[PDB]
């Protein structure tokens, strides 16, 4: 029992982190096989960031403009190229610690673990869910750029995120490992406005199943609702529309607890309409949206 | 910016985890150097757990009673003994991955990372605090016993927790790495239950300090308080009494921010009496108590 925001164990990742310096800028890189991946803004000075032209900035660099340090050992860069918003550096050593891996592009509402890193050194690990608006609510300090986000399936690390930017409102923006930004954002230090973050509805439902699977059932009720009537309410509370696909996904949790998905939706509609009245669910006073159904099943069994 | 509850990276720990089986019971063990540490209850059947004499149960066992597996390599037990509530199994191979380490007994309110493990293989990692009532609010499932709690400083892992039991409220109990239970709990399946818990006042205050460090001052006020007057209020709200020792512990944060500790206490007292007004602090609608002053300084 119990339910916690749990990260994946970080050891496979920890062995891929390196430091990348270009001039006066140091940030993290990911060393897999014979390639190191890092934010392309490593090539920018702080002034540069105001209005960078990356292609211009890049040709003015050579393989040795880049110093890559793994632990002590310094790796010799023998190639460099730009893929979208990432720099790829070929190095002269293959990483002995490279895990089975893949690169994935995550869908909003999905979750992943982040290994916060400073100067190529791992500092902490936490779980965050990509927001609907494609931001994440992270803890990044200066020098955290290039820190990565991942999921682990069996022995295979699926890398999904690399940290690039902090938004004026304090939220964080980044790319997939092909260097394409999640969201509208760009690697320029200018005001860029986040969308409006809609609460994940599927996750909140999954959490309610977790709560039940953990014996917190006060919120349940005799009622049912149609999907349409649910949405008509949820959408007043800035909740994402619920779809049959979402309802289908919840089926296993529905089966495990015996509470029908639409019945849970009826509970939620009430919680939304009437608040929690000083009660808590799984210890929260708030409806939690950062757990996926998979997260609930992984954790709750 | 941002503030999140963060666990220590787990790789140094992941290297030490093994699976220990005795009879039909399988649980996790920690392999450091030539020794494997695990809950002594690995030796007890379900019916044993109701009323066990551990010394009686243990003499009945031999070294080969215990199967230790590191990944797919079987270790060979060449010795065994019991230390408080742990079994120490001597094995014929030393763990090549042993990190620098130590064993620490944590104090109530202090925090640590937990690597949840099943069948010797690490499943997840999370951050948690030792509650004033001596339990942890973990996420553990059957087979999680022997999973460990640790802090990392530099390259040294300090182990402070090993998982033993789940209590009726769904909270968890365990021992230090010498095998001594935190709290009044025992490794017997009895009616024992967690005591009433309290909020960790020291931690909430540290967290308020984090909030100002991170640029937020909304909850601050023009007032001050005596410690006693603070305790008088906070206690009504089920807060742990604040000690002078706690006030000193907060000294570095107080200096960093220019906010005297008792001035922060005044802020907290108002928050308690008035509530948060729909507002949040560091993204939370509630007063968070699982960040120690050290954690705050770490992260900030």
Curated annotation (Swiss-Prot), chain B:
Subcellular location(s) per record: Host cytoplasm; Host Golgi apparatus
Topological domains annotated Cytoplasmic: 1-300
Active site: 41, 145
Catalytic activity: TSAVLQ-|-SGFRK-NH2 and SGVTFQ-|-GKFKK the two peptides corresponding to the two self-cleavage sites of the SARS 3C-like proteinase are the two most reactive peptide substrates. The enzyme exhibits a strong preference for substrates containing Gln at P1 position and Leu at P2 position
Domain Peptidase C30: 1-300
Impact reported for residue 189 to P: In strain: Isolate BJ02
Record's subunit section: Exists as monomer and homodimer. Only the homodimer shows catalytic activity.
Listed name of the protein: 3C-like proteinase nsp5
Organism ancestry: Viruses, Riboviria, Orthornavirae, Pisuviricota, Pisoniviricetes
